[PDB]
Amino acid sequence: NLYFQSMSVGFIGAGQLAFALAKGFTAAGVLAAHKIMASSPDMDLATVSALRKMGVKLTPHNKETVQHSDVLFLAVKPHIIPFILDEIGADIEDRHIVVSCAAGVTISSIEKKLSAFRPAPRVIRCMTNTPVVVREGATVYATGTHAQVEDGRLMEQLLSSVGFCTEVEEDLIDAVTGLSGSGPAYAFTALDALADGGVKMGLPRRLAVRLGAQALLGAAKMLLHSEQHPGQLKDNVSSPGGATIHALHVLESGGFRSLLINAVEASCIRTRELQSMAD
Amino acid sequence: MSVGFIGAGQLAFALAKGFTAAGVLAAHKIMASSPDMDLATVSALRKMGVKLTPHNKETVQHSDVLFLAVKPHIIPFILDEIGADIEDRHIVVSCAAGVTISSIEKKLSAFRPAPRVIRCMTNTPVVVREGATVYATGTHAQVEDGRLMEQLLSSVGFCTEVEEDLIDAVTGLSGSGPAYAFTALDALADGGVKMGLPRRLAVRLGAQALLGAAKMLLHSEQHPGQLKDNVSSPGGATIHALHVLESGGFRSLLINAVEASCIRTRELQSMADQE
Amino acid sequence: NLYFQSMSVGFIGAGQLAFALAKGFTAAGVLAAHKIMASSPDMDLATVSALRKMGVKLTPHNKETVQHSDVLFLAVKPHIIPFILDEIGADIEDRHIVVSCAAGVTISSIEKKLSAFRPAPRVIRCMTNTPVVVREGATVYATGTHAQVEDGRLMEQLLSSVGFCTEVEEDLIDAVTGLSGSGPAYAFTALDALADGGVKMGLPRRLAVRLGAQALLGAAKMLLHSEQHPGQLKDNVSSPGGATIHALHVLESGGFRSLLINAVEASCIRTRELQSMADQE
Amino acid sequence: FQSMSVGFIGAGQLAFALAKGFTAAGVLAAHKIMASSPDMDLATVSALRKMGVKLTPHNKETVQHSDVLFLAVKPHIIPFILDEIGADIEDRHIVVSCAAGVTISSIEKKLSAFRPAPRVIRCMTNTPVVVREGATVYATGTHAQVEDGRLMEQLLSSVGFCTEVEEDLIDAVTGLSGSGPAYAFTALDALADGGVKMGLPRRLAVRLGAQALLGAAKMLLHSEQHPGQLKDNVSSPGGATIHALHVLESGGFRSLLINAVEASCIRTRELQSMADQ
Amino acid sequence: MSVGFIGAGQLAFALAKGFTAAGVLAAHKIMASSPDMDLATVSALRKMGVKLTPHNKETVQHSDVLFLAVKPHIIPFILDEIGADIEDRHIVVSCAAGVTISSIEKKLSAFRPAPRVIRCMTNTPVVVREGATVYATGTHAQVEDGRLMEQLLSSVGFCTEVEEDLIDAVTGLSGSGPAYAFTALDALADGGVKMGLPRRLAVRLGAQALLGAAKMLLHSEQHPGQLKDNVSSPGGATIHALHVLESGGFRSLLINAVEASCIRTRELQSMADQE
Ligand SMILES: NC(=O)C1=CN([C@@H]2O[C@H](COP(=O)(O)OP(=O)(O)OC[C@H]3O[C@@H](n4cnc5c(N)ncnc54)[C@H](O)[C@@H]3O)[C@@H](O)[C@H]2O)C=CC1
Ligand SMILES: NC(=O)C1=CN([C@@H]2O[C@H](COP(=O)(O)OP(=O)(O)OC[C@H]3O[C@@H](n4cnc5c(N)ncnc54)[C@H](O)[C@@H]3O)[C@@H](O)[C@H]2O)C=CC1
Ligand SMILES: NC(=O)C1=CN([C@@H]2O[C@H](COP(=O)(O)OP(=O)(O)OC[C@H]3O[C@@H](n4cnc5c(N)ncnc54)[C@H](O)[C@@H]3O)[C@@H](O)[C@H]2O)C=CC1
Numbered sequence A: 001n002l003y004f005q006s007m008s009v010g011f012i013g014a015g016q017l018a019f020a021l022a023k024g025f026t027a028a029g030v031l032a033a034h035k036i037m038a039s040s041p042d043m044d045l046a047t048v049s050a051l052r053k054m055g056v057k058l059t060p061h062n063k064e065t066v067q068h069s070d071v072l073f074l075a076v077k078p079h080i081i082p083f084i085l086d087e088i089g090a091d092i093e094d095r096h097i098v099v100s101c102a103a104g105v106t107i108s109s110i111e112k113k114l115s116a117f118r119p120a121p122r123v124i125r126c127m128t129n130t131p132v133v134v135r136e137g138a139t140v141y142a143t144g145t146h147a148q149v150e151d152g153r154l155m156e157q158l159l160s161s162v163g164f165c166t167e168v169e170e171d172l173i174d175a176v177t178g179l180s181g182s183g184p185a186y187a188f189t190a191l192d193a194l195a196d197g198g199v200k201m202g203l204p205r206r207l208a209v210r211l212g213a214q215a216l217l218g219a220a221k222m223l224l225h226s227e228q229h230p231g232q233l234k235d236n237v238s239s240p241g242g243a244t245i246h247a248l249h250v251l252e253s254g255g256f257r258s259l260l261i262n263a264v265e266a267s268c269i270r271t272r273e274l275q276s277m278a279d
Numbered sequence B, E: 001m002s003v004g005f006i007g008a009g010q011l012a013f014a015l016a017k018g019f020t021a022a023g024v025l026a027a028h029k030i031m032a033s034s035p036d037m038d039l040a041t042v043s044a045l046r047k048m049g050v051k052l053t054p055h056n057k058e059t060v061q062h063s064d065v066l067f068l069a070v071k072p073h074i075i076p077f078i079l080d081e082i083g084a085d086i087e088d089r090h091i092v093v094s095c096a097a098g099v100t101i102s103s104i105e106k107k108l109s110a111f112r113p114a115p116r117v118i119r120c121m122t123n124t125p126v127v128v129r130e131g132a133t134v135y136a137t138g139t140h141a142q143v144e145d146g147r148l149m150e151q152l153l154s155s156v157g158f159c160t161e162v163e164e165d166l167i168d169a170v171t172g173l174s175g176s177g178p179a180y181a182f183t184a185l186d187a188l189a190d191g192g193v194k195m196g197l198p199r200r201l202a203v204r205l206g207a208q209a210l211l212g213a214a215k216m217l218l219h220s221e222q223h224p225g226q227l228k229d230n231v232s233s234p235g236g237a238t239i240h241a242l243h244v245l246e247s248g249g250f251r252s253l254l255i256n257a258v259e260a261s262c263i264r265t266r267e268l269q270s271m272a273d274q275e
Numbered sequence C: 001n002l003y004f005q006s007m008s009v010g011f012i013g014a015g016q017l018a019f020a021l022a023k024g025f026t027a028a029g030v031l032a033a034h035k036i037m038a039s040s041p042d043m044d045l046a047t048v049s050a051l052r053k054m055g056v057k058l059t060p061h062n063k064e065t066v067q068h069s070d071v072l073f074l075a076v077k078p079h080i081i082p083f084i085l086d087e088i089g090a091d092i093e094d095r096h097i098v099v100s101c102a103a104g105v106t107i108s109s110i111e112k113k114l115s116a117f118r119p120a121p122r123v124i125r126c127m128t129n130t131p132v133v134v135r136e137g138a139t140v141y142a143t144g145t146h147a148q149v150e151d152g153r154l155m156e157q158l159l160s161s162v163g164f165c166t167e168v169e170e171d172l173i174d175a176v177t178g179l180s181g182s183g184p185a186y187a188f189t190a191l192d193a194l195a196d197g198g199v200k201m202g203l204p205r206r207l208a209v210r211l212g213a214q215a216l217l218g219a220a221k222m223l224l225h226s227e228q229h230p231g232q233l234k235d236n237v238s239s240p241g242g243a244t245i246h247a248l249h250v251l252e253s254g255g256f257r258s259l260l261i262n263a264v265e266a267s268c269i270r271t272r273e274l275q276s277m278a279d280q281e
Numbered sequence D: 001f002q003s004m005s006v007g008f009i010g011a012g013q014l015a016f017a018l019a020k021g022f023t024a025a026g027v028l029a030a031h032k033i034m035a036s037s038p039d040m041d042l043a044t045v046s047a048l049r050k051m052g053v054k055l056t057p058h059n060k061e062t063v064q065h066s067d068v069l070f071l072a073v074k075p076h077i078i079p080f081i082l083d084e085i086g087a088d089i090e091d092r093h094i095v096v097s098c099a100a101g102v103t104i105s106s107i108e109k110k111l112s113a114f115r116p117a118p119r120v121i122r123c124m125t126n127t128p129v130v131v132r133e134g135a136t137v138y139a140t141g142t143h144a145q146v147e148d149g150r151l152m153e154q155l156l157s158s159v160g161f162c163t164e165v166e167e168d169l170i171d172a173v174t175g176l177s178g179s180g181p182a183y184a185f186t187a188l189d190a191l192a193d194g195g196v197k198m199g200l201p202r203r204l205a206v207r208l209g210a211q212a213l214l215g216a217a218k219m220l221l222h223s224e225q226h227p228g229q230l231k232d233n234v235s236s237p238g239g240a241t242i243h244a245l246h247v248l249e250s251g252g253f254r255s256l257l258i259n260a261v262e263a264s265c266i267r268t269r270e271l272q273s274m275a276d277q
């Protein structure tokens, strides 16, 4: 991997996503823990000290991170992005590749901020999720106006080391946020509820969590490796008159499917609001 | 070691495919039997190298480990057909939902005393070697019988021994669970399509998100609520979506499901035990 | 062993919050009641009657409070605040710290009014709740433009004597209002209902109120003193197949969680919406 | 509580919670407690171990050690336990059953086949004894001495509120204060979600919501006033609180908490009507 | 007669398959074009005999009847690309949902006056020659243009002329309608499976019942309520099931669907017309 030979990486914002990618990247063995830098105005958080246990260099000053970094991740709340771009924008050299992870924030807003300091800022927008921490992430990215082709290919190689990754048009990223960005939280809620179900029927809680998580993992893997439609796989499991089809009825009766549609839609719609509450 | 399957449908194919993929069993040392020797699962096992037959008696004579993978109401008819063919060497592994070790031991004890019986509940993801399997050892299962089953089935997913009275609840949880996930994924994909994603991409991303979250939980020392907290940034998109799931009673629906599947499982065995 | 010997406290407004804070400050020992003065236009209030028993000095004239006080709590309704500021703005001195407890009212609107009379007024915005009265309040505060560093430390010192207190950014305070400011009323509603349930299943009302409140108190204390997620503590009570997991299910079937999220949201939105119509007017 | 020896049959969540509370209170030396379980691998067993509690796989050893013996196993284990160690219950023992649903009557039936006057007490407590803010009730059996009830009240009062009740109230208490902490933890998790939705950091929103519930409960305990009156004092006309109370009312918030207490009480009586038959 | 398709996806395959099955068009006289000349619909048309190309201009030059079967937001880009290639001989048939005759005529009138434009709304069952199709003739459509389109499309299903302002409502009804039916059938099949039927049999019987009822209504002079009456015997099984549909507001859900699809169709065209 000549891409990652001597590449440095930095994070502005040292929160949940910064730790997850740093944990993912280092576990994948694509980068050394000391070759990554993160910043936060609060070195007192949990994420900050976990990153330090990793051996990640931590500083309070975002201008330190930009100086040390080839690829620069922006891992801060959406409304901070233009505040950060004012602060470090005169420090963005032509060598930098600025990868924005903030939900909603458009390539255009970032480029307008940085194109006032140097004409051709190299910007990539990305939407990832926390399972990169076990190298099973789901990632999309869109390339900006001045991103060279090697920048898209480096980004793919880097983010494929921690999970699935593909390029998309930027107009899809809000919807991806609602689906795979927020998706893991839908899954954690589901697994907690399924374990409550297991407990209600007599199972020890530890066992019920394990069995629920394994069933969801196995089922998602089955879908990824099958050519068959989701409903065909459901049919394979649903014996006539059986326990499973009886359970599927009660899911249907509460509008189970519509709740997951509602969830993707509400996250996507909130992601658009977060962007226009910047423009 | 020689393994047999009575019933050559969905579950037989999943386990045999997983065993052979795992490298713990060679397809030629596996024999499976079914009457309608024309079903699609039959052909899938035949293109796989499994030995096939319409005679349940030939499967018994060929195997040391004998899986029962027929619909639960068929188990008694099978135990009658082959009960006289069971030898000392056999381990009988019932995969049937609801069917008790007691009921199997009572039908097979009329032919030879001390049948070695194991009850398991598994699920279809054994096909990709990510199944969830529990098992209970029967009255006459020796020590090496439970250790062998756990070794064999650990090769196609998670596997642990349980007291038999947990198994109907496991059935509602990890037995039916993949169908809950398949439903969830079809719906998440519809959500992704509603918001502008192509179906193909939406299916892939939804499935990858469920898999990754599941792997995270399994590999973490943390409560699923705590992992939920990390994803849901303050004022953010995730916590907005979580609210609409809560407003629908999302959690209660999953509790309802596990319960309904467990209760149906007991109900079915009750009708079996009534006769 | 805290005590502010050179500090005189005043309250403009002598209703629920002022009584709650005066009662808590005095029970904490940090403030003798006679070093506290409160003012209200209705000297025949139950709260004014209560404050009089504690020894607090009472007056109808707000200027009197301002002239006596160093730390000046604005404890009137949000829409009264601009009239209060117009009346006593010319009486604010350098020595004053103005602590606004009004829901929604920004530091900016207070500072703009008072800056017309004397530049650089020292303003602190505060969100607290009634349990300060038993010294278990939840308080956040934000420091204004001209508040010294010792002003915030002093206010955190003082408000810490009656419960939890921390500094926050001002743009979090409307959300705190939705959670801990309105939070006691959610709890009172919950305890009335749980007691109703205890009565339905055959408990005497008095016992059912006691047990319910003790259960909420103990659980909240457990969470405050644990490093564990609330779901984990919940799991320790929910024995497999037991009574508790059966009750959790019916709570889940009603959307219990979403109602509490709805409540926090509704209180915060209303807090923003009151302020925004004050700003226009 | 001079030199009392305490035992728990069952080394699970409640056994840990009470042992933690009693040693926190300083009423018991950890090493004067003995707990038994057939699975010495559990996390509760490791925590008890680190506390200094004596652990053993043999229930008979717990019994011989104890003066006060707590039964802290699942309700349906209780008859298996009494069969097993029933011949080892001595006249000096006070047997305290913590199991939801199990009646004094059913315990005395099993035990009096061995000695004629087993001293039995039934209680319902909850996990906040761990921070000495438990809510505990107890009822005295046929042969419990007057001193036995006073001893038990003194012991349980050191880790929270404790009062004697008639036994016919204990299933209802189970639904209220026994299961109550779980309802509170659910409430707190949801209040924090709401705080996060409106823009608070998770840690701060957990802290403030917990502080709010604790302070409100304490207010009501120290007030001679109806909880509706206290609610009135919080909600200013046209204000934020009264808007939030409305959306709670529109979802039937009150009725859900009533359904909860009722469902847990009814389940508790089912956990006994199954054992009895 | 030579027919062309710009866009070679779901709808192009359905219509071409139906036309050739019908015998009104030979596959070799049909040309279709797409950029991603790799999609599965592309291969299905290639195994069919349709002529294929990545150049939209070649489709125009080859056809007399030119169908537009691209996603609605692509229509303007296409009208720009080929507007200069349109000749007097062409009939332009837009299949795009929402897209108005006005908007197409305005883009093509900038190159040659009086373009012959037809707007239709069709659906996927044209693939089995049972589609539902309406059409509106444009400003410069001669008389033989509307009669030709009706002849061509009557061969793959029902076809009638409508005023253009009904077409967005038709889209919510018969355009999206097959998806409502597919959903209904998956669910009826689940119902059949819950009550003991094998999935395969349940799918077949459900689909046959919907088809037969639909044919009955189309071939009867009677109100659908009256046909409902004949099936529901007094005290019987049908009227019990109808009650549970009514208690769920079954009818209102279908009204909601048609409305939601119609409204989304107008909304989308509004965003198009805004720019
Ligand atoms: N948490 C998740 O699962 C995902 C989050 N994201 C995005 O990542 C960004 C952060 O997500 P989280 O890490 O969850 O937020 P987080 O708040 O845990 O981390 C954000 C960090 O930024 C720090 N920060 C605040 N002001 C700063 C400043 N002026 N300069 C530098 N650092 C500053 C804060 O101290 C905080 O720790 C958001 O934009 C979110 O949309 C994207 C994908 C998934
Ligand atoms: N499909 C699933 O998701 C799971 C299934 N199981 C259990 O495994 C068993 C079957 O599961 P599936 O394979 O899904 O059912 P299936 O219907 O695919 O397999 C049934 C097989 O039994 C065969 N059969 C019928 N009568 C027979 C006889 N007299 N002798 C021999 N074979 C006979 C049929 O020909 C068919 O091949 C059931 O007891 C079910 O509870 C366990 C857990 C999950
Ligand atoms: N009660 C609560 O739970 C909390 C109250 N607050 C805030 O504190 C303020 C008041 O709280 P409450 O005491 O509940 O209101 P309250 O209505 O109980 O007392 C209000 C006081 O304002 C007095 N007042 C009216 N006009 C006045 C004037 N021109 N000059 C002086 N006093 C005047 C009234 O006579 C009364 O004594 C409000 O802004 C409220 O948002 C904040 C947190 C919690």
Ligand SMILES: NC(=O)C1=CN([C@@H]2O[C@H](COP(=O)(O)OP(=O)(O)OC[C@H]3O[C@@H](n4cnc5c(N)ncnc54)[C@H](O)[C@@H]3O)[C@@H](O)[C@H]2O)C=CC1
Residues within 6 Å of the ligand: C236, C237, C238, C239, D009, D010, D011, D012, D013, D014, D015, D036, D037, D038, D039, D042, D059, D071, D072, D073, D074, D075, D077, D080, D081, D098, D099, D100, D124, D125, D126, D127, D178
């Ligand atoms: N956890 C709670 O919040 C409360 C529980 N209780 C009651 O306390 C009892 C247990 O509560 P948890 O500790 O939650 O159960 P738990 O399941 O956490 O612990 C149960 C203990 O019993 C042990 N055990 C199993 N068989 C045994 C045997 N034959 N001999 C000795 N020990 C054996 C288990 O290994 C485990 O250590 C139940 O009856 C429950 O109703 C009462 C009030 C509150």
Ligand SMILES: NC(=O)C1=CN([C@@H]2O[C@H](COP(=O)(O)OP(=O)(O)OC[C@H]3O[C@@H](n4cnc5c(N)ncnc54)[C@H](O)[C@@H]3O)[C@@H](O)[C@H]2O)C=CC1
Residues within 6 Å of the ligand: E006, E007, E008, E009, E010, E011, E012, E033, E034, E035, E036, E039, E041, E056, E068, E069, E070, E071, E072, E074, E077, E078, E095, E096, E097, E121, E122, E123, E124, E175
């Ligand atoms: N699928 C259905 O049920 C019905 C579809 N329609 C309409 O027909 C049109 C397409 O329907 P589908 O075929 O389902 O969409 P589809 O996505 O299957 O076909 C779209 C085709 O457009 C092609 N395309 C994209 N850009 C192009 C360009 N610049 N030049 C040429 N071809 C290009 C794509 O490669 C793809 O083959 C839409 O306007 C839709 O409203 C009408 C009624 C029902």
